[PDB]
Structure formats: structure tokens, C-alpha cells
Amino acid sequence: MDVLMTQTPLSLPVSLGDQASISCRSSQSIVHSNGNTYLEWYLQKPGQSPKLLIYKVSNRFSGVPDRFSGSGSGTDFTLKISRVEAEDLGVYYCFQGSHVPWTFGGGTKLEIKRGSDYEFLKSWTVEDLQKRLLALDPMMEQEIEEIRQKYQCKRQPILDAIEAK
């Protein structure tokens, strides 16, 4: 009693203005008892919370542009981005809500090809570049807080040994 959600690929390096396609394969059929197919696509910006993008295979959530499209055929479901913009970067997750337990996908990171090289960021606008710089602070603060909580994990036994004394 478990349906596997296989997302593919794991990383989709693209340039701005290109077409992107992410697939999600279900181990079993995913039609709900009421006849619907509760296939959902979520996008998570780095350091932020996931946001619903597509629901019921091909229905766009409120606020999602027409560049995002969804499709399916039973066990294969594909999300498509016609013109990748800077706001679309992040990790995409496919999700099923037809059979308990409802399962999530592994995730597909949509990133910029050779974004580490500044020569391939000169085509970007200054506005999108400062947005990209701002997008790293939630990521860094999250990783820092993970280190802090690990040392709180280590600090508590010593604090409790002092409290016993």
C-alpha cells in the first residue's frame, strides 16, 4: 500500500528564455475514488516555503503565469515551462493525493547552466541579479540555524549535568 513518485531529472540546467520539462512517474495508477486525478506540482524557492503551482494535473493555481503547463496520461505526468524566467528557479515537487498514503516526489532542481560563471550572468538584468543575491540569504540562514541546533543538541547534556549539580 504505497505509490512511488519518481521525479526526473534530478537537475535541469537551463538558460533564461529556454523551454523546460520535468516528468513525474507513478508506480501505480493515481485516479481518485471520485474520478479525479489529484496530481499536484509544487515549487519551493531556496530557504522559503513550498508554493502550489499546478493542481489536478493541468489546472493552474491562482497567480501562476501561462508559461507553466501541466499534462498527464495515467502514470506519466509532465510539467512544462515555456519561457524560463529568473522567478521560476528552485526545486519542483510532484505530489499525489488519490491513494493513502499521499506521497511526494524526490524533487527536480531547475537552475541556471554555468550560473557560477559570471560571463553567463551578463545577459541578466541588474534587477534580476540583485534578486538572485537576495535569494541566497534564506538559504545561508537556514544552514547556519542547522549548525546552531546541532550544537544545542550537544550543549543540553552538559547543561543537564550542571542542573543536577
Partner 1 sequence: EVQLVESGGGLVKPGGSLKLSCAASGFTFSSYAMSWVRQTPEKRLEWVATISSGGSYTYYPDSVKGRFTISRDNAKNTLYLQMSSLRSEDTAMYYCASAYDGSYYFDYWGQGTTVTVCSYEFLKSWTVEDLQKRLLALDPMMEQEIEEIRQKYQSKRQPILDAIEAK
Ligand X SMILES: CCOCCOCCOCCOCCOCCOCCOCCOCCOC
Closest CA to 50 of 8, 93, 13: 93
> Quick check: helix, strand or coil at residue 2?
coil
Which is closer to ligand X, CB of 13 or CB of 97? 97
Size of residue set near ligand X by CB under 6 A: 3
Among 13, 50, 72, 97, binds ligand X (CB under 6 A): 97
| 129 makes contact with partner 1 (CB under 8 A) | yes
Query: Distance between CA atoms of 29 and 59, rounded to whole angstroms?
Result: 19
Among 30, 37, 55, 108, binds partner 1 (CB under 8 A): 55
| 15 makes contact with partner 1 (CB under 8 A) | no
Query: In terms of C-beta density within 10 A (0-12 exposed, 13-18 middle, 19 or more buried), how is residue 92 classed?
Result: buried
Residue 41 CA: distances (Å) to CA of 94, 105, 124, 134? 5, 9, 27, 25
| 61 makes contact with ligand X (CB under 6 A) | no
Q: Which residues bind partner 1 (CB under 8 A)?
A: 1, 38, 40, 42, 49-52, 55-56, 61, 91, 93, 95, 97, 100-104, 106-107, 115-118, 121-122, 124, 126, 129-130, 132-133, 136, 139-140, 143-149, 151-162, 164-165
